[PDB]
Structures are given as structure tokens and as C-alpha cells.
């Protein structure tokens, strides 16, 4: 009895129409257990039956599409072929005879999903009936069948296995014909969207892009026609094309640009359409800047449009009385125009944007309208970052003109001027502060103290915060008194008003300003401490209600920053009371969500108090460690939806969606990610500060941070998780080697896997640095055989990638659009690659130092790439690091390194005379380390190395700030060769020349070595150093005194004592000491006295 089943199905669909929770649950429970084949047959029967209400049919079609796209793998295979053929034929029949547009589109979606899920293998359609139907559909007479074909093509652009072989011409003809009719506009829009989708799907295909260039005029005409009918569906397609594949527009780019300008200048369209038209050009500038830079006229015409967008300010009288930082909008014309100006200035560069916007800004800053002045000040604020280098030499007049607008008849213009000053202080730092502090600080303080408007005061205080944050401490001390005054009186007044009224806007900014001033003044804030702590605590004890939570958090942060600045000594007199306040706050507020503003201010406050209270803080660790760990391990809500379903969730509570490939939507909730990053960073700080006292919580933090390496939603979380790795090992070292081994077994596999997987270059470099540090912590047996094999494979892959990226960048050059800015971008990529090579060398050095001679068979597989790095035609950054790796091999894997000497020894000897100072330094260090840890095998090469080193040293331009370090390394190498291999040096002839080159002052670990050699020669006997009697002693004393200056560390290093004792060894007879010291500068005498006193 199918009639009863159909009646029940219609009843449950009607229930689903207006569900409520009861029949929601009951219908879900009933539906989730229905057999798949029966489900398919019933849904097809329901779709076929054109008798029930449209809602039931649409709902059932949505069910069929969702069921297919979700679980096609279990409701299609292992079923009779008759059923499959019947359902395919039924779908085609429903498509053919459907009349209503919405239902036809839904069944088209269903059929496209089926064809997508029925491709299989390497790609070949198993449903030729579908392709045949599409072809006889698009070339038909009735418009419904053509719409069905075009929607099927748009939904899955790619129902083909041999499109290039035969079907490309047919596709192009079909699309061109469809974008030609004049009786049915709906066909033109659908064909334009289908063309955009087809081009987007077939990315990275230059031949297709050049073959489909004739369709661009039709696409532009279609989007022009559709935008005038309140339909921006094709404009979104144009934005997507410009975002993903801008090269497709290269044939007709100018035309496209003009269209956008028209669509951006037409006032008839609503705000969204004009903003999308502007976004076309903005996205083109962001993505393909080299293509856009050739059309300067379009930019010069689009800048006035954006400037005229920002004049679209509504006169609001409920402005001066606003007590909250209400969100701007991100929809109004002014904010969208300002953001577009910022993005285009950042993308195109200042060299092009600045000349055409500067005159407009200077002309608008004179129009008596209070809106043109506001727009000019906001444009000056917005173009600050993008036109950084070009505006650096013009800052004087811009600053002098902006500071004149703080004294303006209109409050909103003064607000804009404060915004401009603050943003310029942020962008042009720290050069803005040094050349303009005297006027900027005075103007901002005058604006803050004397004002009747309470929104100009807060923004002036924020500008002062931005200014003082980056201001160096040296030039702020003169202004400390004049800041503490005019910051304390205003606090007193605003705190008085907070008790009676409910004003909090300017008090928060004043509190943050005081916190910033104290933070950047450090220990100089002591005399003013008593001026602020009694009041600030008064804010924390009060302000317990709601809508003051941000004020309480800011006050607590200010208290913590003031305490950290004044230090532990002064803070430990109100520290108990502040501890009680923080404990009470923590026990009180811990009942709200994770977006509560007191959840990122309390954690940082606890970390700052830990920094202040060192080891005494261990008492409060159980209390803080609860909520911090709770908010450090929150799982963001993620949902994988369909694109047709993503629209339907337009509530937008915070969901961030991304259009995944092939009709899918991937959404994550970015609510609490920043709190997670802050909590992870504070865990890192806690471990670093506590060390041995963090051992109780080490296991939990390890088990939490190890998964966080593969947390691609936030880069800060991954960076913090990588950084915490060696600190936790150092914390767990206390419990013994077994605990260290357990933690290392937790971390090693995850770190190795994350090294060879991380997309980001910065995060990857941090991960490799952390892995190298962890290996350095645990030596001689920290890696298994599996870890060794995986590391070898990953490092070989990284070196191959580094070699291939150079060729890829070279191919990127010599392009149709290559200019200076493209070269700068390529240089930045090269710098990133060199940084990754640096981290690879760091890992190799750690492994070598830990394993010694036992690791050379593992290094055999990496040897060819390292030899490739030292090729003479390679750039100096590659050769330097190849030589560094070979130097590590020599230092730690000898005397077995002779097996590899044929690969590097001749390049090492040759590169000592290189033009690049870094390669010279690397070669000199290799030659020096050859003698110290090389044994008798490298004896004959020292005789060859010595003359080259002395020639390099004695050449001119050796002590200049560039070649100085290489010369110091060469001196150290010659000293090492003299000491450890004196048989083949003829020391009696080199040492008198060597004494001339001494001392070393900017290379620290070579300076200790050379001074150890000097002491060893002095402590032993006469040769060279002390000739006839003691007449040579004054020059060695002068050398020591000259080298005193922060070179031999005065912390009683073993070398320095051996030096100091020598100074006290001669300090027995006054006759010699007087004549040795009579020819020294007063600074030299003071240096000798300090050296004698220090050790």
C-alpha cells in the first residue's frame, strides 16, 4: 500500500514545514533510519508527483540532493542496475518536463550532484546520457530546457573526461550563443555565471584562458545588464574571477576596469552594488598589481570615486553623548571607501598612488563643509601605510597641517585629526616620534585637557597611547612630569564623574595611556607610583556591575603594567592587596562565555604578576592554572556545509565561511581564537619564567601543545606551541632522564611531522628552530632510526624545494608584467628561503653536535645537496650556509671527515678570497676549525691555508664595518693553526705579525680563544711575546687594555681571570708596572683597574 506511505511522507513533510522541537526530533528520528534505496525511490516519486504543495516538492528535492552529496557511497553501489537506470531516466524526465523555475533548478542541482558523484577513476563520465541530454538541451527552442542545461553546466563545470580533445569548441560556441539573445535576459545572466564558473574550475590553463578570451565582452555586457536589474549575481562572479584568475581578464582588462568605474559612479545602484564594483578594482590591485599598474588612468579616475564615498557622512546629533565604542558598520559608504583606499594604497604602492591623491587631499582639507575635511584627514590616515617610503620625506608639512586641525570649529574634524595623528604615529614609527615629539605631545595634551566634547578627549588619549607606545625611553623622560600631570588630574575628574554619572569612554583611554607611559618609562615611574595606585585600585574595587567589564580589565592591566615597570621592590607593599583583588575577580567573573572582555586581560595580568613575583608566585599557580588551561584548549566550532545550504544560514553570529571546491562550504567560528593564542603564549611565558617550578603542570601542557602544532586556524597558536617545546623539556628535566625521555617521545614525532608539512614559512622556521633547540637539550640518543629516516627525507625535500624555488622565481621573471615591485616581492621570497635554509643548518648543527661520528652514514644521503649548495655559480647566501654545514661536519664528525674532504676542502681553500664577507667568514672558520679538531690528517693543508689567510688579513679595507668580522675570523683561524699545529707554521715568523692584528672586539667567541692563546704564550715562556727582558710587555698590556671594552665578559669567565692574574702577575714590582702604564690613555688606566677589580 504505497498510498499510506505517501500520505505519511506528506504528513511528515508538512510537520517539517512548521516543526518546533517535538516533531523536529520525531521526524529526524523517523527519517534517519529509512532504507537508502527506499529513500531514493520515495524521493523520486515525491518529486515526480506534481499534486502536493510546492513546499513539499522543494523540501524533498533538497533532501535528495543532500542525501546524494552526503552518502552517495552507500545508496548507489551494490544495487541492481535496473534501479540505477530507472532513477537516471526519471531525473532526466523530471528535468525535461518541469515548468516552475525553482523546482527545475533544484532538480538540476540533484542531477549535477549525481553526475559529480558518478565520475570515478582517473576521470571519465559513466553517464553519457547526461552529456547527450545537456547538448540537445542547450541547442533547443524552449527556454526552460536551455536554463536547465546552463544550470547543470554551472553547478558542476566539468562534466567531461575529454573536454579538451573534442568538446572545447562546442562549449565555447554554446556559451557565446547563450550570451547573445535579446528576448530572454535570464539566459544571458546564467550563461555569464556558467562562463565564470567554467573558467574558475579550469585554473592553471593558459591555453584555455587564451582560447576563451573572446567571451569577455559578452560577460561584461551581461554583468552590466544584470547590475541594472537589482541582480549582482554576475558581479560576484567577476569579483571571484579577478580574485582567483586575473590573467583571464588580461585580453580586455581595460574594458573591465571602465565598466567597474561606471558601476562605481552610478548613484542609481544601491550601496552594495557600487561597493562590489569598487571591490573589482581593489581586488585586481591586491592580486595582480603588475597588470593594473600599466593602466594609471583607471587608478587616477577611481581615487576620486573612493574619496567621494567618504564624504557620505550622515549628520548625527547623537555623537558627542555616545559612551560606547559602537562598531563602525563595514557597510556604509565612508568605511568601505576608506578600507578600499587603504587596500589599494598598500597593493599598488605609494610611488603611484601618492602623486594623484596628495593634491586631492590638500584640496579637500580646505573645503568649508566639515565632511570634506573629515574625508581628507581619513584619507591621510588610510594611505599612511601603503605610501610609507614616499611619504617619509614629506612628513614635515603633512604633520604641520594635521596638527592645525586639532583646533577646529567642528568636533568631528578634530576627531579625524586625532585619528590621523595616531595612525601616522603607528605607521611611521619610530621616526615620527623623534622628529615631532615636541609638537605632537603638546598638541595632544592640550586637546585632551581642555575639551567640552567627550569623544575628542578619548580619541586624543588614544592618539597619545599610539604615540608613546613606540617612543624610545630616552626622549620621554623630559616629558614624564608633564604627562603625569595632565594624566592624573583628568583621571581624578573622570573618576569623580564615574561615581555620579555613568561615563567610562575617556576614563578607559586615560587608564590605558597611564599604563603605556609607565610601561615605556620602566623604573622612572617610581616617584609617580603613589599618584596612581590608590586611585586605580579604587576603580577595581568598584565597577563591579556589568557594562564596566572593559574598564575593570583595562584597570587591572594598568595595575599589572605599573607594577612590572616599578619592579618587585616597590610593588611589594600593595602586592598583597592587588593579589586579593585579582583573586576575588578571578573567583567572581568565572561564569561567563569565552568572549567576555575579562578573559584576555586577566590572563596577561596573571603572567605579568608571575614575572614580577618570580618564585614567590608559585603559591598562586593552582588558582591561575585552572582557567588558563580551560581557555587554552577550546575547540572552535567547525561545520562542513553545502554551498546551497550556506546561504540558508544567513544569521551570521560570527560564522566565517569559505567556498570550498566543487559546491561545498567550509565554516569556522572565529570566537575565542585570539583568546586561545593569548593563553598559549602565556603558557609559554609561564614555563619560561618558572622552569623547575612548572614540573607539576608539564605533562598537561605537553599533551595540550603537541596537538596544537597542527592547528591551521591560527598562526599564533602554532607558533606558541612550537616555542613551548624546549621550555617544557627544561621544566621536566628535574624529574630525571626517564621523564625527559617520556616527554621527548611525546614531542619528537609530532615535531618531525610538522616540519615537513607546515605551509607558512615563518611558522615553519619557528618549528625548525624549536626542534633544533630540543635536540640540543637531549644529546647522544634522542632520535630513533625511524626518526632519522623521516628527518633525512624531510630535509632532502626541503633542500630540493629551495633549489627548485630559484628556478621557479627565474621563470616568474621575464614575464609580460615585471617591474620593480615584483622584484621586491621576489627578493622577500628569497629572504624567506634563505631563512629556511638557516634553520635547516641549525637542525644539522644540533644533530652533529649531539651525535658526533655516529651520524655520517645518515649525512651521506644529504651530502649531494650540500655539495650543490657550494657550487661556484650559486648566490652567496647558499654558499655561505653550505660552508657552514661543512664546518659543522669538520668540527663534530672528525677525524672521520677526511672521507668527505674532497668535496669541500678545495672550495674552502678557494672561498677565503671571496668578495662576499659572509662566505669569507665561513671559509675562515672552516680553516680554523680544521686544525683544532682535524688531527694529523689535515696537516699539509694548513701550510697552504696560512699564506691565503695572511694575505686576506693584511689587505686594505679589512677593519671597515663589513669585512671586519671576516678579518677577525681569519685572525682566529691563524691563531688556532699556530697553536694546535705549530710544526708546519713557523710560529717564530708569524707570531710577531700576529701580535699586530690583535685584539678582537666584535667577535666574542673567537676573542676568548685568541686571548686564551695569548695567555698560554704568556704563561709559558719568552717566545715573541716577551723579548729582551720585558721591553715588549707594554704593547701586550696596551693590547689587553684596548680589548677590555665589553669583549672579555667581566662575569669571571675562565679566560678573563687568566688575563687578570697576568695583570696581577706583573703587579709585583713597581718599576715595570709604572713604565708599562705611563704610556696608556686614562681610559686604558680605568680599564686596567676595572679588569683587576672584576677578577
Amino acid at each position: 500500500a504505497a498510498a499510506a506511505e505517501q500520505q505519511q511522507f506528506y504528513l511528515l513533510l508538512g510537520n517539517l514545514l512548521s516543526p518546533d522541537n517535538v516533531v523536529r526530533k520525531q521526524a529526524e528520528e523517523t527519517y534517519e533510519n529509512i532504507p537508502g534505496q527506499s529513500k531514493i525511490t520515495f524521493l523520486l516519486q515525491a518529486i515526480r508527483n506534481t499534486t502536493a504543495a510546492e513546499e513539499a516538492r522543494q523540501m524533498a528535492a533538497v533532501l535528495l540532493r543532500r542525501l546524494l552529496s552526503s552518502a552517495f557511497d552507500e545508496v548507489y553501489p551494490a544495487l541492481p542496475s535496473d534501479v540505477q537506470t530507472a532513477i537516471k531516466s526519471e531525473l532526466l524526465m523530471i528535468i525535461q518536463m518541469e515548468t516552475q523555475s525553482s523546482m527545475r533548478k533544484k532538480v538540476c542541482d540533484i542531477a549535477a550532484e549525481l553526475a559529480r558523484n558518478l565520475i570515478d577513476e582517473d576521470g571519465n563520465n559513466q553517464w553519457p546520457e547526461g552529456l547527450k541530454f545537456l547538448f540537445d538541451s542547450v541547442s533547443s527552442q524552449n527556454v526552460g530546457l536551455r536554463e536547465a542545461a546552463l544550470h547543470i553546466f554551472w553547478n558542476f563545470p566539468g562534466i567531461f573526461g575529454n573536454q579538451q580533445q573534442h568538446y572545447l569548441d562546442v562549449i565555447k560556441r554554446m556559451l557565446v550563443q547563450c550570451m547573445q539573445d535579446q528576448e530572454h535576459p535570464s539566459i544571458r545572466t546564467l550563461s555569464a555565471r556558467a562562463t565564470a564558473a567554467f573558467i574558475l574550475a579550469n585554473e592553471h590553463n593558459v591555453a584555455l584562458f587564451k582560447h576563451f578570451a573572446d567571451l569577455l565582452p559578452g560577460f561584461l555586457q551581461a554583468v552590466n545588464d544584470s547590475c541594472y536589474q537589482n541582480d549582482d549575481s554576475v558581479l560576484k562572479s567577476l569579483v571571484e574571477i579577478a580574485d582567483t584568475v586575473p590573467k583571464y581578464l588580461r585580453p580586455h582588462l581595460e574594458a573591465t576596469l571602465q565598466l567597474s568605474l561606471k558601476l562605481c559612479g552610478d548613484t542609481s545602484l544601491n550601496n552594495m552594488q557600487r561597493q562590489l564594483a569598487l571591490e573589482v578594482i581593489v581586488t585586481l590591485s591586491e592580486t595582480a598589481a603588475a597588470m593594473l599598474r600599466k593602466h594609471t588612468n583607471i587608478v587616477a579616475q577611481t581615487i576620486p570615486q573612493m574619496l567621494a564615498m567618504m564624504v557620505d557622512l550622515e549628520e548625527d546629533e547623537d555623537w558627542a553623548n555616545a559612551d560606547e565604542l559602537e562598531d563602525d558598520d563595514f557597510d556604509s559608504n565612508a568605511v568601505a571607501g576608506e578600507s578600499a583606499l587603504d587596500r589599494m594604497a598598500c597593493g599598488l604602492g605609494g610611488k603611484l598612488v601618492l602623486p594623484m591623491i596628495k593634491e586631492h587631499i590638500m584640496q579637500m582639507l580646505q573645503n568649508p563643509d566639515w565632511k570634506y575635511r573629515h574625508a581628507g584627514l581619513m584619507a591621510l590616515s588610510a594611505i599612511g601605510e601603503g605610501c610609507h617610503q614616499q611619504m617619509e620625506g614629506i612628513l614635515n608639512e603633512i604633520v604641520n597641517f594635521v596638527l592645525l586641525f586639532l583646533q577646529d570649529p567642528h568636533p568631528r574634524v578634530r576627531y579625524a585629526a586625532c585619528n590621523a595623528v595616531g595612525q601616522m604615529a603607528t605607521d611611521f614609527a619610530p621616526g615620527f616620534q623623534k622628529k615631532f615629539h615636541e609638537k605632537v605631545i603638546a598638541a595632544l595634551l592640550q586637546t585632551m585637557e581642555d575639551q567640552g566634547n567627550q569623544r575628542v578627549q578619548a580619541h586624543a588619549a588614544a592618539a597619545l597611547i599610539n604615540f608613546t607606545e613606540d617612543c624610545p625611553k630616552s626622549l620621554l623622560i623630559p616629558y614624564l612630569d608633564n604627562l603625569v600631570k595632565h594624566l592624573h588630574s583628568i583621571m581624578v575628574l573622570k573618576l569623580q564623574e564615574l561615581i555620579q554619572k555613568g561615563t567610562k569612554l575617556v576614563l578607559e583611554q586615560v587608564v590605558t595611556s597611564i599604563a603605556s607611559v609607565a610601561d615605556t618609562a620602566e623604573e622612572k615611574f617610581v616617584p609617580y607610583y603613589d599618584l596612581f595606585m590608590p586611585s586605580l585600585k579604587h576603580i577595581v574595587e568598584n565597577a563591579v556591575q556589568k557594562e564596566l567589564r572593559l574598564l575593570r580589565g583595562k584597570t587591572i592591566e594598568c595595575i599589572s603594567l605599573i607594577g612590572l615597570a616599578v619592579g618587585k621592590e616597590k610593588f611589594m607593599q600593595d602586592a598583597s592587596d592587588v593579589m586579593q583583588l585579582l583573586l576575588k575577580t578571578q573567583t567572581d567573573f568565572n561564569d561567563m562565555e569565552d568572549d567576555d572582555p575579562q578573559i584576555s586581560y586577566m590572563i596577561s595580568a596573571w603572567a605579568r604578576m608571575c614575572k614580577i613575583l618570580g618564585k614567590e608566585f608559585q603559591q598562586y599557580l593552582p588558582v591561575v592554572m585552572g582557567p588558563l588551561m580551560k581557555t587554552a584548549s577550546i575547540k572552535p566550532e567547525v561545520a562542513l556545509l553545502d554551498t546551497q545550504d550556506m546561504e540558508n544560514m544567513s544569521d551570521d553570529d560570527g560564522w566565517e565561511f569559505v567556498n570550498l571546491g566543487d559546491q561545498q562550504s567550509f565554516g569556522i567560528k572565529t570566537a575565542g581564537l585570539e583568546e586561545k593564542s593569548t593563553a598559549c603564549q602565556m603558557l609559554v611565558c609561564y614555563a619560561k619564567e618558572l622552569k623547575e617550578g612548572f614540573v607539576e603542570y608539564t605533562e598537561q601542557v605537553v599533551k595540550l601543545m603537541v596537538p596544537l602544532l597542527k592547528f591551521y586556524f591560527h598562526d599564533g597558536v602554532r607558533v606558541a606551541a612550537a616555542e613551548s617545546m624546549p621550555l617544557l623539556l627544561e621544566c621536566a628535566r628535574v624529574r630525571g632522564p626517564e621523564y625527559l625521555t617520556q616527554m621527548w617521545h611525546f614531542m619528537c614525532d609530532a615535531l618531525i611531522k610538522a616540519i615537513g608539512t607546515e605551509p607558512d614559512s615563518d611558522v615553519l622556521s619557528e618549528i625548525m628552530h624549536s626542534f633544533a633547540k630540543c635536540i640540543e637539550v637531549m644529546g647522544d640518543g634522542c632520535l630513533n632510526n625511524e626518526h632519522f629516516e623521516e628527518l633525512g627525507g624531510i630535509l632532502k625535500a626541503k633542500l630540493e624545494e629551495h633549489f627548485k624555488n630559484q628556478e621557479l622565481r627565474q621563470v616568474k621573471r621575464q614575464d609580460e608584467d615585471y617591474d620593480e615591485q615584483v622584484e621586491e616581492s621576489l627578493q622577500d621570497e628569497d629572504d624567506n628561503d634563505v631563512y629556511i635554509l638557516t634553520k635547516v643548518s641549525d637542525i644539522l648543527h644540533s644533530i652533529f653536535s649531539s651525535y658526533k661520528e655516529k651520524v655520517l652514514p645518515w649525512f651521506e644521503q644529504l651530502l649531494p645537496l650540500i655539495v650543490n649548495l657550494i657550487c661556484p655559480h650559486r648566490p652567496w647566501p647558499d654558499r655561505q650556509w653550505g660552508l657552514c654545514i661543512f664546518d659543522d661536519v669538520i668540527e663534530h664528525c672528525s677525524p672521520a671527515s677526511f672521507k668527505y674532504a674532497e668535496y669541500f676542502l678545495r672550495p674552502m681553500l678557494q672561498y677565503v678570497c671571496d668578495n662576499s664577507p659572509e662566505v669569507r667568514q665561513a671559509a675562515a672558520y672552516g680553516l680554523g676549525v680544521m686544525a683544532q679538531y682535524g688531527g694529523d690528517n689535515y696537516r699539509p693543508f694548513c701550510t697552504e691555508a696560512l699564506p691565503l689567510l695572511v694575505r686576506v688579513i693584511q689587505s686594505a679595507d679589512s677593519k671597515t664595518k663589513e669585512n671586519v668580522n671576516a678579518t677577525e675570523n681569519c685572525i682566529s683561524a691563524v691563531g688556532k693553526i699556530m697553536k694546535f699545529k705549530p710544526d708546519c707554521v713557523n710560529v717564530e715568523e708569524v707570531l710577531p705579525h700576529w701580535l699586530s692584528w690583535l685584539p678582537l672586539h666584535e667577535d666574542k667567541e673567537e676573542a676568548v680563544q685568541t686571548f686564551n692563546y695569548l695567555c698560554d704564550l704568556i704563561e709559558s715562556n719568552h717566545p715573541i711575546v716577551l723579548g729582551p727582558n720585558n721591553t715588549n710587555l707594554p704593547k701586550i698590556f696596551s693590547i689587553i687594555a684596548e680589548g677590555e671594552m665589553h669583549e672579555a665578559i667581566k662575569h669571571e669567565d675562565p679566560c678573563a681571570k687568566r688575563l687578570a692574574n697576568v695583570v696581577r702577575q706583573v703587579q709585583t714590582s713597581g718599576g715595570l708596572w709604572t713604565e708599562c702604564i705611563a704610556q696608556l690613555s686614562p681610559e686604558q688606566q680605568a680599564a686596567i683597574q676595572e679588569l683587576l677589580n672584576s677578577a
Binding site: N419, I465, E557, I668, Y712, D715, P759, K773
Partner: protein
Amino acid sequence: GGSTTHFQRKRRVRDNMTKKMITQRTIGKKKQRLNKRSY
């Protein structure tokens, strides 16, 4: 390879005092890479 030549984090930076009312944090678009390029 020289100790000092290793472990240098030249290309890194840090800061304090989170909030900064006057800022260019608006960043509605840009920095669009989709590091979660999986599944």
C-alpha cells in the same frame, strides 16, 4: 658552525599592551590564504 651564526631570530618582533583603539586592524579582506587547505 660558529655558534653565534646559529639560532639568530633576526626576522622576528614582539609587543605588549593589547587593544590600541586607533589602529588599522579593520582588515576585512587581505591576508586571505586559507592555511586550512585540507579535506
